[PDB]
Amino acid sequence: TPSLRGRLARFGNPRKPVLKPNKPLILANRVGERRREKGEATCITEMSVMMACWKQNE
Amino acid sequence: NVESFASMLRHSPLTQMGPAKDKLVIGRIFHIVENDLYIDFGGKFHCVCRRPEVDGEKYQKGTRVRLRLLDLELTSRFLGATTDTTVLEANAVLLGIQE
Structure with missing residues (x-):
């Protein structure tokens, strides 16, 4: 796990901040939803074979 | 003499x-x-x-078993928590029965 010592801008931290999170680095009591995978067009290769055969066979 | x-x-x-x-x-x-x-x-x-x-x-x-303790209590402090999160159980590997 990456270190957080001296990263955020805080009192007593002399160096300029390393991380600038837009949300507090605090664990929530929930996880993200089961994100769906965007469907891709399927059977394109077989469709191509069929269409090429159609073109060759009128 | 207590x-x-x-x-x-x-x-x-x-x-x-x-x-x-x-x-x-x-x-x-x-x-x-x-x-x-x-x-x-x-x-x-x-x-x-x-x-x-x-x-x-x-x-x-009531069975007597031989355990190999790894930790008496499973605790770990996580991101942002102020106190260690404990599951209120130990961590041990069950080897077998003792006769």
């Missing part, structure tokens, strides 16, 4: 053990939930171990 608490703690077997990592202890099963065995080995917290495939029926309530 023994003091410091004397009891100094000579207690748990103190004599030292660190609990890789220490063989003798636990007693006190509760069984399907294949989960809840074993008390004299520590503050019990351990939960899966019933072994071999001699599974040989593990019953």
Whole structure:
């Protein structure tokens, strides 16, 4: 796990901040939803074979 | 001549053990939930171990088992928490039965 010592801008931290999170680095009591995978067009290769055969066979 | 608490703690077997990592202890099963065995080995917290495939029926309530302790209590502090999150159970590996 990456270190957080001296990263955020805080009192007593002399160096300029390393991380600038837009949300507090605090664990929530929930996880993200089961994100769906965007469907891709399927059977394109077989469709191509069929269409090429159609073109060759009128 | 009443023994003091410091004397009891100094000579207690748990103190004599030292660190609990890789220490063989003798636990007693006190509760069984399907294949989960809840074993008390004299520590503050019990351990939960899966019933072994071999001699599974040989593990019953009151059985004495040989455990290899990894930690007396499973605690870990996480991102942003102010206190260590504890699951209120130990971490031990169930070796087998002691005769």
